[PDB]
A paper describes a structure:
Here, we show that repeat number variation in predicted bacterial surface proteins is more widespread and we characterize a third rod-like repetitive region in the Streptococcus gordonii protein (Sgo_0707) formed by tandem array of Streptococcal High Identity Repeats in Tandem (SHIRT) domains. The structure of single and tandem SHIRT domains from the streptococcal surface protein Sgo_0707 were determined. We call SasG, Rib, and Sgo_0707 “Periscope Proteins” due to their having variable-length stalk-like regions that define the distance that the N-terminal functional domain projects from the bacterial surface. Taken together, these data are consistent with multiple tandemly arrayed SHIRT domains from Sgo_0707 behaving as an elongated, rod-like particle.
Defining the structural, rather than sequence, repeat boundaries in repetitive bacterial proteins is challenging. For Sgo_0707 the T-REKS server predicts a repeat frame of 460 through 543 and 13 repeats of 84 through 90 residues. A construct based on the second repeat (residues 544 through 627; ΔN-Sgo_R2) was folded and solved to 0.95 Å resolution using X-ray crystallography utilizing ab initio molecular replacement (MR) with ideal fragments. Based on the significant truncation of the N-terminal β-strand (Inset), we hypothesized that shifting the frame of the repeat by seven residues toward the N terminus of Sgo_0707 would complete the fold.
Author numbering: 542 to 569, 576 to 600, 610 to 625
C-alpha cells in the first residue's frame, strides 16, 4: 500500500512541511496516519482531513494566518 498527499484548498499547493509527513509504503489495508495532523507554515496552517482509498490519498486543507485589522 502506498500513500500520496493532495491539497484540498483551491489554488494552494502543498508545502514541504506537509510532504515531509508522507508515510512509508506498507509492505504486502488501513492507512498509516501522518505523524501530526496540523502543520504551521509562514503563511498559515495546514490540517489533515482524511484518507480516501492500494493507494491511500490523504487530503490536506489550508487556513491562512489570521490578520489583525
Amino acid at each position: 500500500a502506498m500513500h500520496e498527499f493532495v491539497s484540498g484548498t483551491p489554488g494552494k499547493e502543498l508545502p514541504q512541511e506537509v510532504k515531509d509527513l508522507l508515510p512509508a509504503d506498507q509492505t504486502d489495508s488501513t492507512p498509516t496516519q501522518p505523524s501530526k495532523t496540523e502543520v504551521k507554515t509562514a503563511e498559515g496552517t495546514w490540517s489533515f482531513k482524511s484518507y480516501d482509498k492500494v493507494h491511500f490519498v490523504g487530503t490536506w486543507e489550508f487556513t491562512p494566518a489570521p490578520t489583525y485589522k
